[PDB]
Nucleic acid binder design. Structure first.
Ligand SMILES: [Mg+2]
Ligand SMILES: [Mg+2]
Ligand SMILES: [Mg+2]
Ligand SMILES: [Mg+2]
Ligand SMILES: [Mg+2]
Ligand SMILES: [Mg+2]
Ligand SMILES: [Mg+2]
Ligand SMILES: [Mg+2]
Ligand SMILES: [Mg+2]
Ligand SMILES: [Mg+2]
Ligand SMILES: [Mg+2]
Ligand SMILES: [Mg+2]
Ligand SMILES: [Mg+2]
Ligand SMILES: [Mg+2]
Lengths: 213, 257, 121
RNA sequence: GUAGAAACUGCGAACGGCUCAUUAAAACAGUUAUAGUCUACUUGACAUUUAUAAGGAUAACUACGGAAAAGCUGUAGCUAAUACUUGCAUUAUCCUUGGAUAAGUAUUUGUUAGAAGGAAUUAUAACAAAGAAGUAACACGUAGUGUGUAUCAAUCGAGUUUCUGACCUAUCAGCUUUUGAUGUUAGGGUAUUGGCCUAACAUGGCUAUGACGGGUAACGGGGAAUUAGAGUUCGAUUCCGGAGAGGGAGCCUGAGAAAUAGCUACCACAUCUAAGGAAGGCAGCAGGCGCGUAAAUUACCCAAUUCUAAAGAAGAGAGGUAGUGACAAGAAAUA
């Protein structure tokens, strides 16, 4: 029925409502994860290819990938699976879930875009949106801006907006795994402590060995 | 569940703590550490019930937050830390020193030693172990490992330990003429010398002790603590010097106005 | 007007910042001289340039009349009083004045907020 | 620099509180053993076969959704860590030289030597094979700490275990052993000993000094009532030990559970509903029905006693305070 189509490359998605057996006939009896032509659901969709990734049935139970049935089943879930979240550590619970074969009793599709066609379908293919968050580990910034050991990394981070009094202030994330001088004090302190312990053990052994007599 | 218990009820606490049987259903429940529960006292009890510095538990907490109380030359902030027999206590703010001892009853007291005496304590040896490289380690009543022990130290004598550095100063043997303090039933603060040793094979060894008033008492071996050679002790003692009179003459003395 | 003060088991407590003592008040053929006059007399005794460093509590009148017992507490400065005296004492003396009454109906908010999830919670 | 709704991570929820159904050499009490074992937090000792700093992925968050309903959740797009991973750089002995090398913590196998305990196949040492896991790619600014880490020892505990000790009944005299009953041999399994289990073998084991059965309106002690001295009768109920969470069985996490305000089924009972489905366990504190001769407030507070935590500062029907109360106890008007 209700279709949710998303474009992974450009981070934009659009929804349409279809109530017709003929328009949705090609989707039937197809598992999740495989491609499917999208001509039949609209004139503008000629040459567009979509891919089934989810959806849930009339009562609202989600679709899961493993089960090879056309209807609802009943499993016991654990920490590492999909349609569950534990309340305690080590908790396991039995719930009812829907198969992965596409049938007439679905209430949503949740399918993504694969290939474009000959028209532009405004609001799904023309636009694009950025990351919404920039990296924080230093090496990631080095790889993002193609830098070297010489290029200081504290200058290449992006603040957002502030317009208090100055037009640009650019408050920036704290970046991690940076080579603070402190982390060198750690190395030298560890080395000196190890050397002191070695000296103490040598002195203790010599005193003991002379102590026997 | 049935795991380790965490609470202690008041009428089940050891009787030498002397806790009021009203005012509460619980006792401080000392932590795990160098001393056993029954042969020790928590720091809260010492610092509230005995010395009267604090009026509640929270005041003990606000005392210990500021780091001014040292046991065995190290600051502690645990309100239920075990404080044990021969342990020295320093309160920096008031410039005071103490050593816990038994009195002639079974109850612990702070003895108020001076500064020069505050630089050592006495530890009794519980066992001697041989480890890798044929190096010896001594285990004391204080829960303490001493490496490179002298070859002439056995598993029942006592040693004198420097506190600034964990090194050994000298040791005292466990003989027929040594001076002793007793640490369990029917005689808990008594000081005498030693008269004889028994050595029963499969069971306990019985030893006899003679007082300085020529009174004789005996106990087990495992509750004997050597504290000096034949002549003199190596620490100061409380007012009574471990001399236990009986009830008739104790009462007679107490009635001397 | 005509009363006498006897201070017993006086102690100095440098770990805290106060002096600790017990108290006995004699007042024959009258009744229960008030706390303010006691504070003023103590201040006159120890020269106590101010009176806001004194705490008194636990006053009993000893059936028969004519005498009273209690406890006292004198601090080095008002900063210590505020630092390490409990709140109800600090309200009776008047050093602070706070009367927030959130109540033990906060348990309802504790419970019905555990059923909502990350965002709306 | 300071503060900081969410969320990831860590620790704790196995302690506390309640009840007495089961249970008659069982549980429990005094007295022993572990040379037959496990042990988080805390305490003391203390280590071995790119380096000016490595990896990818996921919460919270944004947009598009489904279901009557529930502490339900789908798809796509980012990003951290003491989460999850990988991995650098030094010395001690043989006889003022030099090479050899140790190149391996626990644990398993084979061959030997040997300060302590009543007793060793004990610490420990050598030779020949295997080999986990680790020794800081972390945080604070107080020369110090915090968090984490291999072995040993201590501490808080537990599992097993020796000897002795219970009410009435013989109209209960012979029980147990094909399907483990009593022993020997070899293994399996467990944290370790053991018919605890499996195969082969033998015919044993208990009993009128009461076995095997029946009954209890029987949880066991510390204790209570009454008695000159002997005795007789009680102990659901302040502390200690045991057992259980409607009745049975099974299981995950974790140092610790056969846990039930943890999970999975069956039997009984019972809730919401759009009829497709989803949720349940007061012998915890109050309170209600029923049962009966027979028993209190749907109150206030963390101030005291203590416990948990990222441990002054938060929380606690543990606990304290008051309300009802001729159970029981003490003093004491009506001159
Ligand atoms: Mg249970
Ligand atoms: Mg307190
Ligand atoms: Mg319990
Ligand atoms: Mg067989
Ligand atoms: Mg009983
Ligand atoms: Mg009990
Ligand atoms: Mg019931
Ligand atoms: Mg259960
Ligand atoms: Mg149930
Ligand atoms: Mg319940
Ligand atoms: Mg109730
Ligand atoms: Mg009644
Ligand atoms: Mg408190
Ligand atoms: Mg802190």
């Amino acid at each position: 029925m209700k279709l949710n189509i998303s474009n992974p490359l450009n981070n934009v998605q659009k929804s349409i409502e279809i109530d017709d057996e003929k328009k949705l006939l090609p989707f039937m009896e197809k598992r999740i994860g495989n491609a499917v032509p999208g001509d039949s659901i609209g004139e503008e969709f000629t040459g567009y290819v979509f891919r089934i990734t989810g959806g849930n049935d009339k009562q609202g139970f989600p679709m899961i990938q493993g089960v090879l049935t056309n209807n609802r089943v009943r499993l016991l879930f654990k920490k590492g699976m999909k349609c569950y979240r534990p309340r305690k550590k080590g908790e396991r619970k039995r719930k009812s879930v829907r198969g992965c074969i596409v049938g007439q009793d679905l209430s949503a599709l949740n399918l993504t875009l694969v290939k474009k066609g000959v028209n532009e379908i405004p609001g799904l293919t023309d636009k694009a949106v950025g990351k919404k968050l920039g990296p924080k580990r230093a090496s990631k910034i080095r790889k993002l801006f193609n830098l070297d050991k010489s290029d200081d990394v504290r200058k290449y981070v992006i603040g957002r907006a502030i317009t208090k009094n100055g037009k640009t202030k650019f408050i920036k994330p704290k970046i991690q795994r940076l080579v603070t001088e402190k982390r060198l004090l750690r190395k030298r302190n560890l080395l000196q402590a190890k050397e002191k312990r070695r000296l103490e053990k040598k002195q203790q052994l010599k005193e003991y060995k002379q102590l026997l007599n | 569940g049935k795991g380790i218990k965490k609470h202690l009820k008041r009428v089940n606490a050891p009787s030498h703590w002397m806790l009021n049987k009203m005012g509460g259903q619980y006792a401080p429940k000392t932590s795990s550490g160098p001393h056993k529960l029954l042969e020790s006292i928590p720091l809260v009890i010492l610092l509230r019930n005995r010395l009267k510095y604090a009026l509640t538990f929270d005041e003990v907490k606000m005392i210990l937050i500021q780091k001014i109380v040292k046991v065995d030359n190290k600051v502690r902030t645990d309100c239920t830390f075990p404080v044990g027999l021969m342990d020295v206590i320093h309160i920096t703010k008031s410039n005071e020193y103490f050593r816990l001892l038994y009195d002639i009853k079974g109850r612990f007291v702070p003895h108020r030693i001076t500064n020069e005496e505050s630089k050592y304590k006495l530890c009794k040896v519980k066992k001697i172990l041989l480890r890798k490289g044929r190096l010896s380690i001594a285990v004391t009543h204080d829960g303490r490992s001493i490496p490179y022990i002298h070859p002439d130290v056995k598993v029942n004598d006592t040693v004198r330990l420097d506190l600034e550095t964990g090194k050994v100063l000298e040791h005292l043997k466990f003989q027929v003429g040594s001076l002793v303090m007793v640490t369990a039933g029917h005689s808990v603060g008594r000081v005498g010398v030693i008269s004889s040793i028994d050595k029963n094979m499969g069971t306990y060894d019985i030893i006899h002790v003679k007082d300085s008033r020529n009174k004789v008492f005996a106990t087990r071996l495992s509750n004997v603590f050597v504290i000096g050679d034949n002549t003199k002790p190596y620490i100061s003692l409380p007012r009574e010097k471990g001399i236990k009179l009986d009830i008739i003459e104790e009462r007679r003395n107490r009635l001397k106005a | 007007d005509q009363f006498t003060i006897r201070v017993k088991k006086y102690m100095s407590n440098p770990l805290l910042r106060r002096k600790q003592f017990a108290l006995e008040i004699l007042h024959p053929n009258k009744g229960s001289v008030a706390k303010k006059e006691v504070k003023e007399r103590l201040a006159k005794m120890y020269k106590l340039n101010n009176v806001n460093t004194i705490v008194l509590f636990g006053f009993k009148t000893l059936f028969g009349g004519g005498r009273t017992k209690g406890f006292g507490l004198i601090y080095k400065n008002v900063d210590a009083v505020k630092k390490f005296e409990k709140k109800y004492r600090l309200v009776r003396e008047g050093l602070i004045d706070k009367e927030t009454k959130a109540g033990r109906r906060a348990s309802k908010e504790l419970k019905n907020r555990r059923k909502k999830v990350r965002g709306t919670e």
